[PDB]
Amino acid sequence: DPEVTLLLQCPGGGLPQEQIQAELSPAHDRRPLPGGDEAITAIWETRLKAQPWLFDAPKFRLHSATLAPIGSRGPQLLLRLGLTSYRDFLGTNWSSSAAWLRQQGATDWGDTQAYLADPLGVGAALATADDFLVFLRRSRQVAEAPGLVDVPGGHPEPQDLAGQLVVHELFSSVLQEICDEVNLPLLTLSQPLLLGIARNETSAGRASAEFYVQCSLTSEQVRKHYLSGGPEAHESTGIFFVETQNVRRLPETEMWAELCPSAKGAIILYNRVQGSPTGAALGSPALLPPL
Numbered sequence: 366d367p368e369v370t371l372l373l374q375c376p377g378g379g380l381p382q383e384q385i386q387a388e389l390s391p392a393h394d395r396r397p398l399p400g401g402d403e404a405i406t407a408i409w410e411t412r413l414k415a416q417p418w419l420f421d422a423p424k425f426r427l428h429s430a431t432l433a434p435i436g437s438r439g440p441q442l443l444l445r446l447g448l449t450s451y452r453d454f455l456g457t458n459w460s461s462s463a464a465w466l467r468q469q470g471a472t473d474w475g476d477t478q479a480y481l482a483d484p485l486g487v488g489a490a491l492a493t494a495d496d497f498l499v500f501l502r503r504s505r506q507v508a509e510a511p512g513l514v515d516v517p518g519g520h521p522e523p524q525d526l527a528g529q530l531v532v533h534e535l536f537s538s539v540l541q542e543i544c545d546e547v548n549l550p551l552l553t554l555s556q557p558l559l560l561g562i563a564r565n566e567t568s569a570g571r572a573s574a575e576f577y578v579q580c581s582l583t584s585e586q587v588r589k590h591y592l593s594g595g596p597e598a599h600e601s602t603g604i605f606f607v608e609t610q611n612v613r614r615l616p617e618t619e620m621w622a623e624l625c626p627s628a629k630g631a632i633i634l635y636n637r638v639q640g641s642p643t644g645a646a647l648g649s650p651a652l653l654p655p656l
């Protein structure tokens with residue numbers, strides 16, 4: 366799977382909000398482009414003069430994520446974050462010249478991402494009460510990954526002493542994205558666990574935080590809630606469900622070729638962090654079938 370790389374695999378079956386620190390600093394921002402940020406401004410102007418209803422929006426930038434020594438007390442993860450925008454994304458990661466910006470970042474800063482917006486995405490492995498994960502079909506008419514399978518999520522917009530509010534907005538945003546797209550009541554959702562961070566190499570290395578969320582509704586109830594919004598209540602064109610039993614071997618299925626990179630990230634991290642048992646009981650052959 367060359368189009369997805371794991372930046373972080375969380376310990377302990379995934380980290381709760383209270384174990385994560387953020388450092389939001391202008392030291393974590395994109396570097397100005399070698400010939401100047403006028404190249405970004407020019408692409409944006411061209412785009413607005415075709416689609417003048419488009420708007421800019423602020424985004425969090427991922428710089429890096431450092432895990433504590435395993436088994437330690439205290440904060441277990443430090444997220445280093447800066448600020449970027451939708452405009453900066455369109456002029457760097459989405460640019461035809463994105464590979465040239467990665468090579469120049471390696472040369473100038475020893476960092477393939479130094480000249481990339483790299484907005485932080487969020488996504489969920491969302492499990493039902495009857496042990497299915499939730500999948501969404503993307504419209505064939507959008508610009509990014511048309512017609513591909515996704516999981517719930519999005520790209521959160523901003524608003525450890527500003528740090529804790531930023532971690533709160535990241536955990537909040539994955540629940541809000543589930544309520545907005547799947548049409549589930551907030552009180553049917555567990556507090557999220559962070560499983561890890563995956564990078565999309567087809568989008569020049571931009572990263573998504575992948576979470577596990579449990580729903581108290583069955584697959585049939587989740588489907589009713591999604592459909593009862595009507596076609597205007599969701600950006601996706603359909604919903605479907607795969608038994609957690611079968612998610613284990615999803616990379617061997619014909620579905621795998623249809624998953625967008627960030628959804629592949631969520632499923633690899635679900636299988637390594639919530640699946641893959643370590644103890645004698647769940648590891649026994651009748652509960653963990655060989656091959």
Ligand SMILES: CCNC(=O)N1CCNC(=O)[C@H]1CC(=O)OC
Pocket residue numbers: 418419420421422451
């Ligand atoms: C639905 C919320 N719109 C949104 O988040 N955008 C990203 C920021 N600006 C935009 O103009 C749109 C572009 C887009 O793809 O929306 C159709």
